[PDB]
Design a protein around this ligand. Structure first.
Ligand SMILES: O=C(O)[C@]1(F)O[C@@H]([C@H](O)[C@H](O)CO)[C@H](O)[C@@H](O)[C@H]1F
Ligand SMILES: *[C@]1(C(=O)O)O[C@@H]([C@H](O)[C@H](O)CO)[C@H](O)[C@@H](O)[C@H]1F
Ligand SMILES: [Ca+2]
Ligand SMILES: [Cl-]
Length: 383
């Protein structure tokens, strides 16, 4: 791999700082957040980087009052290289005391499309959870009021402002569903121009052209709830999803016109039942797909970034442990992740981190780390 010839480069620092941290991130209104979790990142066509997260107001739990927050790089050409290159925290949407989450952006010229999930603030995935005011949650159900909704918000000004989110549940989530998720992480634009956004049991597919997109659903029997998608070097689609039980990533390959294979466990990619991320890096010799998850069947703290050179992303190298370049003072790193390719030819990654001050409890502060590294950094890892 000729990219190994570059000097290894890596930088890493917290970008979304929980309430316990010195420079805890708050909106300009004064509204702060206990925890940030569920990252999504995209480089726009200007080179600006947009980083999204769930701002979890009161504790780290997946329900209750959660706002969709973000940061942009200050300019289109700084590549988020230092903390001072990032704007202050902003909000995409935070209306109501319900949950706005699952950021899943896709860039289309320019327009950034950001798909989100939402639930009512009286409901949770399991039900029976206690809220700050003493209310007990109802379990997410199939009713309009109590089901998981799918929203779309758009930016046509490089992420500066966002349209009021539009509820596309009736159009893009099957009737009768209760739980739902989009991404989280990112959607993609194919070499042939279609937009493909991974979601629970389905792709959301944007046909048409830039400036005139039309959305529909490609259902995928056996897909995960939290999916990732990319275009492999052979031109086909590749779903690499979180499994329902700890063990291994589940994978399927297909096309928009012919559909997908069934999903199968990939024994080369252990996973502890956690979200992952995938990135098409380049098309020229040699073609590369990047994959990032916790490379373990029982821990989220074994984050590993990897490269596949296969036309179908069948097999990956060992890659490199993110712990080889650890961050201090921002918790124990590991969990959900998102990757993009920066305009200065780095991998830019967001990774969850957990202070663990309340163990697995709701009071444990969660932060999100930003990382940049070149391919060389991965390739020069001790395997
Ligand atoms: O509901 C919230 O989280 C909030 F506290 O109020 C939201 C909103 O003004 C109200 O919920 C009504 O839409 C803000 O967008 C949030 O930043 C925050 F201030
Ligand atoms: C995530 C997690 O940290 O495990 O889990 C998902 C969801 O519960 C699982 O995919 C099972 O359906 C949450 O939606 C997400 O917020 C995060 F908690
Ligand atoms: Ca809110
Ligand atoms: Cl999910």
């Amino acid at each position: 791999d000729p990219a190994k010839d570059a000097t290894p480069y890596h930088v890493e620092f917290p970008l979304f700082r929980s309430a316990n941290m010195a420079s805890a991130d708050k909106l300009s209104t004064g509204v702060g957040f206990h925890s940030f979790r569920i990252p999504a990142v995209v480089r726009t066509t200007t080179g600006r980087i947009l980083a999204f997260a769930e701002g979890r107001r009161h504790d780290n739990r997946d329900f209750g009052d959660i706002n969709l927050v973000y940061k942009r790089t200050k300019t289109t050409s700084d590549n988020g290289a230092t903390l001072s290159d990032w704007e202050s925290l902003r909000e995409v949407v935070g209306s109501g005391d319900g949950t706005w989450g699952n950021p899943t952006p896709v860039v289309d010229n320019g327009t950034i499309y950001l798909f989100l999930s939402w639930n009512n603030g009286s409901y949770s995935q399991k039900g029976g959870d206690e809220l700050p005011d003493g209310t007990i949650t109802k379990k997410i159900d199939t009713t309009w009021y109590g089901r998981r909704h799918l929203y779309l918000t758009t930016s046509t000004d490089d992420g500066n402002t966002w349209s009021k989110p539009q509820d596309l549940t009736k159009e893009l989530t099957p009737d009768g569903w209760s739980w739902d998720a989009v991404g989280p992480g990112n959607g993609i634009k194919l070499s042939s121009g279609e937009l493909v956004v991974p979601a629970m049991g389905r792709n959301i597919v944007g046909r048409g052209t830039p400036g005139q997109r039309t959305w529909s659903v490609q259902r995928l029997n056996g897909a995960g709830a939290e999916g990732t998608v990319c275009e492999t070097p052979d031109g086909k689609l590749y779903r690499n999803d979180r499994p329902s039980k700890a063990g291994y990533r589940i994978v399927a390959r297909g096309t928009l016109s012919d559909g997908f294979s069934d999903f199968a466990s990939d024994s080369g990619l252990p996973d502890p039942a956690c979200q992952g991320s995938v990135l098409k890096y380049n098309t020229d010799a040699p073609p590369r797909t990047i994959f990032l998850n916790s490379a373990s069947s029982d821990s989220r703290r074994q984050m590993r970034v990897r490269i596949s050179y296969d036309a179908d992303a069948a097999k990956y190298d060992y890659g490199r442990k993110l712990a080889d370049a650890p961050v201090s003072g921002a918790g124990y790193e590991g969990g959900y992740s998102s990757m993009t390719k920066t305009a200065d030819y780095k991998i830019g990654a967001l990774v969850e981190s957990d202070f663990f001050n309340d163990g697995t409890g709701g009071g444990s502060y969660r932060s999100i780390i930003w990382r940049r590294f070149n391919l060389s950094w991965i390739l020069n890892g001790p395997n």
